Design a protein around this nucleic acid. Structure first.
Lengths: 127, 34, 181, 220, 214
RNA sequence: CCGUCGUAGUCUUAACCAUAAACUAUGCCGACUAGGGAUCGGGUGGUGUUUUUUUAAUGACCCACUCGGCACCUUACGAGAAAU
RNA sequence: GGAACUAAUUCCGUAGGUGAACCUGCGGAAGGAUCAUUAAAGA
């Protein structure tokens, strides 16, 4: 029915990436993030910003020749947090209600058959 | 001086009211009562 | 002009949700106007949006989030709150994320979050207006962003092996400085 | 006439805010539309160009789509209806295609012009009499006047060192004045009669100023 | 002062002949210019489409396919097989607690000498009357299962030219012959191919690629 | 009450050192004294179940028993300052 | 400087240290306060 592209949302903490590409991936179409739509460092991840970046992305998305899109949501991953950032579901919620018909969305956070020593040491990191 | 003295299915909340401080920072019923 | 979102249902949380099902699907289909099918054989909930009966495009996305919230082992009332308030989000992390713990060390760690008779776990939610789920190695949080960030720091302070008292201190500190504002 | 992103095109009267008629049209984005009219006439023709090489000459009085010309292999960026009837359609790919138009079914391709530039826009200039030179705007920004009888270019107004493309050309035509909107965000006025000479250059906007330094004796 | 979208030319991607729907998706390139062209860029791209979008039927929600572009002909670029994956969400649900997981794999050749490594996973199921919840096989069990799976997989790969394996995987006959030779060792549930990758393809041969397309 | 850079080190070979709350904070071998349900390994018994093919043979499962394990439960006709 | 005018948690082993009222890395111990849910091959 529509013209399909790929949404692909990387939502870590301290920032959230939204950017749509051609269904193959090789050629992209507009990006914009949460760090872009506010200036305060501390407020780089928050849903409020992602919503704004969802808004910008939706504009250019339909500005070229895309009408619909499948999303591939994703946390940091690797030897890092493994859990979805705040402004990723909020970045998808603001992208869902924008006309761009969605379809089939899986998680793609890189998960290892574990290893490479995590950072932090025996004491560990964030507190 | 003699007279006597005397919701919606979808809730509506402002960005500042909820946990969206960043949205409020860039943010920009009397008739119904009448 | 349809839309189809399909969410898998966990077997452990499958029985309570199916039992309350009769309390579960009516607020969706009736209050939000939506199609809620349920495949028992595939254990998958299917949320479809009808253009004629759906006023808001976002409601279909909201319905999927509500099903997931209950999926994560949260209460039906907590799931209902997600539809009612937008500002409510869920955060999930692995104990192995914050501090690599083996065997009993992990076990005890979990207890420090729960506490005797849930007392340690209940205090954090009340002072942070949130809902927490203590699964296996996964912990889930449900509530406002500003509320969740304070709650995550308190939970992490516990998982780092800090004593419960200290965490009570930080807890009433934060709850005071936020309920004040 | 308005062309939607979806490709559905609706015609709205300028004077009154109502839609005289709505056309479902071809299932593609609409690149451009061209209206044909006489101060007083019983015949009005509207031409719509899709993203793909399809041209539909919708007839307003008839309320029918007369003709389909998928000679083009790419979206038709510019459409010019030549005076009686031949239809000239700018081709995004590189092919600029002549056509024969009629109220009746008969229609045919009179000629095809191969030009080494993208046809951003094209038009028919009365100047030069019987040998009308089609006005062509390209991605390279080299304006081209091309014989009708032969494919050779009588004169090219410029090649510009700056790597810019003219988005579209607004031409008075009766006054023989052509306005070219350049990809460096400047407007050039070119008169229509080997290299076209711009009468004057008007710059709409300066994107960034590296530095401000005064020059010249007058200092204006 | 340029705009990338107003320069590229839209292209059409067509799936292999042995599929429910030939049409797949559209892509952006860059005008076939003298010195660097649109012809070169299109040839090396691949596309991941869930075969349920590619077969329609949903009893196929998981299982993703790699389609690689090899040849092109004016607004019409064809594709062939490049691999198969599962979906991450489906795989996570399958790994239930208190049950043995079993995987096995082999690198093996076909007729039209593509070389591939195919995968296979299965889990010990509970006997429908069993009091004990764990239902774990016995390593000796596991060893035997993998050797038979390995046996069956090598038989299918050598027999299949390349496209035939494709025709073999879609109705999952492999999945069942496994269960069949297996049920004499130990129960088992799920049992899927799970993932197949390509690592050595022969040589272009423009003739063979055209035969697959209809 | 941390953040950054980061030497040794972290890994491996050949050789050293030669001790830890090296902890069940409880020598070794054997023998007697009391109940219960789970589980790991082995074996025996069954016109048990399930797998179909043409019944089997297999296999996985169920019941009873028996050696030897890792543990838990309840208690005493026992012990202890008491937890046990 | 002069002189007018107006305004008014504990611990162990080990190693190192120059913001060392002692701390820090690696590995251990507890002699440190378990709430809640739990048949979903429920073919």
């Amino acid at each position: 029915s529509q013209v399909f592209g790929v949404a692909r949302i990387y939502a870590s903490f301290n920032d959230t990436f939204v950017h749509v590409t051609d269904l193959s991936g090789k050629e992209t179409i507009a990006r914009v993030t949460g760090g872009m739509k506010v200036k305060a460092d501390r407020d780089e991840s928050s849903p409020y910003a992602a919503m704004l970046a969802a808004q910008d992305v939706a504009a250019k998305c339909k500005e070229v020749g895309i009408t619909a899109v499948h999303v591939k949501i994703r946390a940091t991953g690797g030897t890092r947090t493994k859990t979805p950032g705040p402004g990723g579901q909020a970045a998808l919620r603001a992208l869902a209600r924008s006309g761009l018909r969605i379809g089939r969305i899986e998680d793609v956070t890189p998960v290892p058959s574990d290893s490479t020593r995590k950072k932090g040491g025996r004491r560990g990191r964030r507190l | 001086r003699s007279k006597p003295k005397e919701l919606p299915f979808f809730l509506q909340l402002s960005g500042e009211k909820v946990g969206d401080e960043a949205s409020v920072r860039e943010g920009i019923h009397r008739r119904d009562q009448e | 002009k349809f839309e189809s979102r399909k969410i898998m249902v966990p077997p452990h949380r499958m029985t309570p949700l199916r039992n309350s099902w009769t309390k579960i699907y009516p607020p969706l289909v009736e209050h939000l106007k939506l199609q809620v099918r349920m495949n028992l054989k595939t254990k998958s909930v299917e949320l479809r949006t009808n253009p004629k009966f759906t006023t808001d495009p976002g409601a279909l996305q909201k319905g999927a989030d509500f099903i997931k919230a209950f999926t994560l082992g949260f209460d039906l009332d907590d799931s209902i709150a997600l539809l009612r308030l937008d500002d409510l989000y869920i955060e999930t992390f692995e104990v192995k994320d914050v501090k690599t713990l083996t065997g009993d060390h992990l076990s005890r760690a979990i207890g420090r979050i729960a506490g005797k008779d849930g007392k340690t776990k209940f205090a954090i939610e009340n002072a942070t207006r949130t809902r927490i789920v203590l699964a296996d190695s996964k912990i889930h949080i449900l509530g406002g962003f500003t509320h969740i960030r304070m709650a995550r720091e308190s939970v992490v302070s516990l998982i780092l092996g800090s004593p419960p008292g200290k965490v009570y201190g930080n807890l009433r500190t934060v709850a005071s400085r936020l309920k004040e504002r | 006439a308005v062309g939607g992103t979806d490709g559905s095109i609706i015609v709205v009267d300028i004077e009154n805010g109502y839609i005289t008629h709505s056309f479902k049209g071809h299932g593609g984005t609409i690149s451009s539309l061209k209206f044909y009219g006489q101060l007083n006439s019983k015949i009005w023709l509207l031409a719509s160009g899709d993203t793909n090489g399809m041209v539909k000459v919708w007839d307003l009085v008839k309320r029918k789509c007369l003709h389909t010309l998928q000679e083009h292999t790419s979206a038709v960026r510019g459409l010019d209806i030549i005076e009686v009837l031949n239809l000239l359609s700018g081709g995004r790919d590189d092919i600029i295609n002549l056509w024969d138009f009629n109220m009746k079914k008969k229609c045919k391709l009179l000629k095809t012009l191969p030009v080494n530039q993208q046809v951003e826009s094209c038009g028919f200039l009365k100047d030069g009499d019987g040998k009308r030179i089609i006005y062509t705007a390209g991605g390279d920004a080299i304006f081209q006047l091309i014989d009708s009888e032969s494919g050779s270019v009588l004169k090219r107004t410029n090649k510009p060192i700056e790597e810019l493309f003219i988005i579209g050309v607004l031409p008075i035509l009766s006054n023989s004045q052509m306005f070219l909107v350049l990809s460096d965000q400047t407007l050039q006025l070119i008169n229509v009669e080997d290299t076209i000479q711009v009468t004057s250059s008007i710059a709409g906007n300066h994107g960034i100023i590296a530095d401000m330094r005064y020059v010249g004796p007058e200092l204006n | 002062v340029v705009d990338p979208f107003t320069r590229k030319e839209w292209f059409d991607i067509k799936a292999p002949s042995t599929f429910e729907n030939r049409n797949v998706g559209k892509t952006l390139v860059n005008k076939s210019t003298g010195l660097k062209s649109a012809s070169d860029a299109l040839k090396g791209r691949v596309v991941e489409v869930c075969l349920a979008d590619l077969q329609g039927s949903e009893d196929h929600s998981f299982r993703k396919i790699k389609l690689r572009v090899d040849e092109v002909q004016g607004k019409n670029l064809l594709t062939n097989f490049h691999g198969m994956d599962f979906t991450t969400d489906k795989l996570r649900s399958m790994v239930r607690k208190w049950q043995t997981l079993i995987e096995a794999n082999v690198t093996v050749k076909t007729s039209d000498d593509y070389v591939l490594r195919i995968f296979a996973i299965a889990f010990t199921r509970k006997q429908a009357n069993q009091v004990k919840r764990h239902s774990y096989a016995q390593s000796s069990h596991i060893r035997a299962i993998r050797k038979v799976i390995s046996e069956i997989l090598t038989k299918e790969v050598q027999g299949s030219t390349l496209a035939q394996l494709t025709s073999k995987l879609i109705p999952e006959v492999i999945n069942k012959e496994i269960e069949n030779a297996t049920k004499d060792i130990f129960p088992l549930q799920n049992i899927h191919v799970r993932k197949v990758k390509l690592l050595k393809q022969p040589k272009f041969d423009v003739g063979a690629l055209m035969a697959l397309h209809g």
